Amino acid sequence: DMPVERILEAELAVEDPVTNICQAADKQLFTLVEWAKRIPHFSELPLDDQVILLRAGWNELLIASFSHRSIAVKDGILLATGLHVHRNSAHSAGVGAIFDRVLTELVSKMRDMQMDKTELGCLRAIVLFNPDSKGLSNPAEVEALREKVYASLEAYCKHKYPEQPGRFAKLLLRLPALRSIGLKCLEHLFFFKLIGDTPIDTFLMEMLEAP
């Protein structure tokens, strides 16, 4: 089984600007590992596959988390360090475009639909169990777990928001945006690493290593 209550529990258990964002990201990578261990069946996968899923998903997973954390923030994001970062600050640091995509495609859409923590948890678990991740010893097994998450999520939405028949599809359709922003985020991080002005801490650095 894949009970949405366990997924919610996982979320609840873990609850210039470029430098601050990068520092916050490094910090949250530790927390991400703890989150993943709390998702049903993840820790039962082979260690090598747990590594692959987390290396494949970490940036989307962190982006989804700070985006949902920021739904009551006007034109900004709330980092896990407690720091609010506004649009103007990101623009003045040369990362306005990517920052605005986060705000318009993720944060404001999460706000508009009042995406809840169960739904966020499920989307994150779907991202985690990515069966397209290269090198998985058993892709079908990860595919099975993803299928169980989205079954439970659809059941949850239909029970909790029966007057919103499109809500489930609406949730899933933020995933392409999440993927694209995740990819653009990586491009920036690789550049910061290349230029070498911004400090990149050890876990974030490791995520930027070749496989």
Binding site: V33, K37, F203
Partner: peptide, 10 residues
């Protein structure tokens, strides 16, 4: 990927 392995191990 030494950090991730160490943290997942437990």
């Amino acid at each position: 990927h030494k950090i991730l392995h160490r943290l997942l191990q437990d």
